[PDB]
Amino acid sequence: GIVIEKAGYKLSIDGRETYIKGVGGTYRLDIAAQSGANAFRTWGGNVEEIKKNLALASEHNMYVMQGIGMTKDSIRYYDDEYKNKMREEVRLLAETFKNDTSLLAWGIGNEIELGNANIAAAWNFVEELAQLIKSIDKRHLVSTVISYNPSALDSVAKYAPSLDYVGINVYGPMGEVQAVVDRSDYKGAFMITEWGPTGWWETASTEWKAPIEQTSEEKRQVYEERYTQYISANTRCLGSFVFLWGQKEERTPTWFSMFVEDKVDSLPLKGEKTPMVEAMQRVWTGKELDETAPIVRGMTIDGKSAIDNVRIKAGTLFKAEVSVTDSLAYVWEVLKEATVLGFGGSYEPRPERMGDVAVSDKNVYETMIKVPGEYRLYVYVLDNTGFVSTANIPFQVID
Amino acid sequence: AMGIVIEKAADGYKLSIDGRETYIKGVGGTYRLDIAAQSGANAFRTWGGNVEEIKKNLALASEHNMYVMQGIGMTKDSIRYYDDEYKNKMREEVRLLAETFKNDTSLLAWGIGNEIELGNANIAAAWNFVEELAQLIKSIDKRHLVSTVISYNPSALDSVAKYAPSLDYVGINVYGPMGEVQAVVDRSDYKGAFMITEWGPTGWWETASTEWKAPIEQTSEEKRQVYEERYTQYISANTRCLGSFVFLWGQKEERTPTWFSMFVEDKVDSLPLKGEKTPMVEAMQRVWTGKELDETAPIVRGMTIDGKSAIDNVRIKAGTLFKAEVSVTDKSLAYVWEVLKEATVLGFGGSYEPRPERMGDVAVSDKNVYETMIKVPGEYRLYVYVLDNTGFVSTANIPFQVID
Known part of the structure; x- marks a missing residue:
């Protein structure tokens, strides 16, 4: 009983209205769970890797949006060999996982439109795979994930009506997301399947073009404000997956990293959590923090x-x-x-x-x-x- | 002396294919290899593929008289380098690749991973497994070179030197300024030959920008000069460098549709461009051939x-x-x-x-x-x-x- 209903839209899981309070990936899900996250998103995996993801989700009482990798080699969408292989793969996944209660949704592709070409053959194939999944797995939602892209929303509306919702990856400013979705041909609910803090292209820079990085206090404010103003305030939005729930070099070691580095030589940091983790506990729980x-x-x-x-x-x-x-x-x-x-x-x-x-x-x-x-x-x-x-x-x- | 060999030269290193000294004049990927070959390119680089995908790459290479640096995909999930299940899967896959392609004359080299050090953690377990995979390939395949590809990373060069002495060469991916590549490699613990496995034109972080922070993009004439200058000063001038793979030999959105694209767009709605080549392709023909151009x-x-x-x-x-x-x-x-x-x-x-x-x-x-x-x-x-x-x-x- 995973249902999206007109209210915008609300999501229910076996009768229980649930907001998707997600992180991108599987880093420190202990801390995600402790912070009041109830979900995570993955990009791919074979059967054994997905079983591991769904066991981690079960340990943490979290839901999974599980990705299925689609090619950016656009010519393959005319290739019956490629399409037969993908139908066999998606059949096996749907047959294996249809009764898992940690799995929430299938993500059929990540940004297929930013392939060699945006073509009808790719979108038609997403819709074919959605029908295939829904013929086997009656429990889970089916989705695709697109870039922050008016053309891609129009494509989904035209070619993939069998999808339950669309994921949108949003990098940079989020003030126009509501208007972009509202203005598109797409009718239905969405999730923001990637979002995060201020980009290094949005900030002031020095005279020598070094982007001026926010303090962790400024970043805390940005995460809370973006969540409150552009995710939870949008009645068509069912939830979101925040980034980067982890650490990775991105102009600086700290730019979008919600944890600091761990095991860098002669740097005594141990992957501590940040005010950016505090920000998400605050907006996910809706409660004030002790620490x-x-x-x-x-x-x-x-x-x-x-x-x-x-x-x-x-x-x-x-x-x-x-x-x-x-x-x-x-x-x-x-x-x-x-x-x-x-x-x-x-x-x-x-x-x-x-x-x-x-x-x-x-x-x-x-x-x-x-x-x-x-x-x-x-x-x-x-x-x-x-x-x-x-x-x-x-x-x-x-x- | 048949097969692919790297030898110490009086100055630096040289690469021979069946006893003939050959410079690697490469492109990244498999887009318009007809134009690459027409321009004087003799090589291309790929990041991965199963047996059937590699057979298609090597058939394309044969049709263009080109060589392939064929990538093997390694994980960025660093804990897997401790896992005998992951390592036995990779040993089986690499054994099959080496056995399948050991006599192919279009294959030049195996690239064991791309930027493994930029995974979850840079660790001994990963570098020791690259060394193990290199010994496994060389146990089966006597013809081809074995390499790994790293980011432009002093620490990675030191890790290859410590852990992976069975590699014939290192690939370095270089984005941004190239003037320090020679000194970085020279100052490192790594002693052998290298290839620049990704290089291209001026980054949008390197240029002037407007008062509203829009990076000012070079004209195609300025880009032509940049491709020629970087190749001539930093690639062909470096006697430890055996060759290179230019980017982007193709088109992709990167700040603008044109920023690092050597071809313009093709089939964009209501834009009558057809993937034409640019002065940046002319630049590579000039430096690859060492000859002046008719057109x-x-x-x-x-x-x-x-x-x-x-x-x-x-x-x-x-x-x-x-x-x-x-x-x-x-004109x-x-x-x-x-x-x-x-x-x-x-x-x-x-x-x-x-x-x-x-x-x-x-x-x-x-x-x-x-x-x-x-x-x-x-x-x-x-x-x-x-x-x-x-x-x-x-x-x-x-x-x-x-x-x-």
Whole structure:
């Protein structure tokens, strides 16, 4: 009894109206569950990998939106060999998992429209696979996931009426999502299957084009505001999967990472949770928190902020300070400004460290850089409860 | 001396195929390999495939007289490198590949993983398994080279040196500036030969930007110069470098439709482009062949709106006509004009980006000028495509803001 009904729309699971409070992927689902998440999304997996996902979900009392990988090689959608292989794969998945009560929904493809070409053969095949799944599995929802793409919503409406809902991946500003969906030919409910904080293309940047990263306090506000204004306020939206519930290099080690790094050499961080995790507990539970992270109000070098275009003479001492609203510990690290960025790929190497990491008991740090260049000073503020708060400041060293 | 061998040279290293010294003049992927071969390319690189997909790649390569660096897909789920179930599955798959293709004359090299170090964790278990897979391949396949591909990563070069001495070479994927590649490899613990398994033109993080943060895109003439300069200074000049795979030999949305695309778009609704080659393809023919070209693309010198350039922060009042002009070095050109919104949905821990929305309709003209108006305030980019009648297209664009 997984049903989407007109109210916009409401989702019910065996009579029980449920909002999908999700994370992208399977990192620290213990913390997701402790934070009041009830779901996670995966992109793919064979039978054995999906059984593992659904056992993890069961341990955490969470629902799964389980992805099925579709090709971006557009010519394959005319190929009966490819289509026969995919029908055999989807038959097996539907037959195996139709009675699993952790599984919520099948995701048939992720952004199939951003393939070699957006073509009717691909959309027709999504609709064929949806019919195939619904002929075997009467329990679960069937969906596809698209980019934030008016054409793709129109395509779903035209070619895939058998879908129960559409997932939309939203990167960057979210203020127009409601209007974009409302204006499209698509009638029905949706989920925001990827969303997150302010992009490095949305923020201010220094004169040398370093994007100015929000403090963890600013990021907390952005996660809560985006959730409240653009997810839970949209009556056509049934829920969402937040990113990045984990850590990955993305312009900086902290940019969209809701956890800090773990097991980086000579960096004594252990993957602590952040105010961005606090933000999601607050909006998922709708309740105030007992434990909150240190509130970072800002950060300076020689009294100047990121927006001031901080320039330091090579070989001169500079003094940093982080302002926090008192068993606190401070971890300080200088990296080069990132120069190897995802350029048609997802993965970026960690920028090179200058000198050594420092730990202090006070909110101040002084050092010296001999090499002219573009740098970033990162501070991590550790309480003794497993929270870490963050800020960084880009600066230039000059001869 | 039959098969593929890397030898110490007086300076650096050299690669021989059946005793003939051969430079690897490669493209990433399998798009328009007819044009790659016509341009002087002798190689392409793939990331994965089953036996049947690899047979198709090697048949395409044979038809074009090209060599393949064939990838084997390795996991970024780092805990799996401890799991005998994952490792026995990969050993079986790699044994089958090595046995199936050991005598193929189109295959050059196996690429054991792409950026394994950028998975969940960079760990000994992963590098030791790459070494184990390399020894397994070389136990069966005496003809081909074995490699791994890393990000542009001093730490990864040190890990290959410590854990994977059975590799013949390392592939490095290089995005952004290339001037430090030589010193980075030289300063590393890695001692052997390398290939640049991804390289391309100027990143949108490297260029000037407008006052509203729109990256200023090079003209196709500036991109031509960048591809030629990077190849000549950093690839062919590096005596430890055995060759390279250029990107993007194809088209993909990356901030703009044109940013790193060496071909323009094909079958976009109400846009009459047909995947024409560009001055960036001409650049690779010039450096691959070392010979001057019979046919060259139109040389775009610049682009204006109302006499102003991209660097001038062009601002136009809503509901007013403006006049664009594209300057071309004079030599029956056609001009295709399109206004898109400045991209706001970018790759954010993903690769794929939707095409930004079109304002109004595409225009085609016989003259190098175009007039239109935008009624909605916002950030836009005007694109021009300059078609000769030989199958080349040249490009420029200009970001502009429409204000109340």
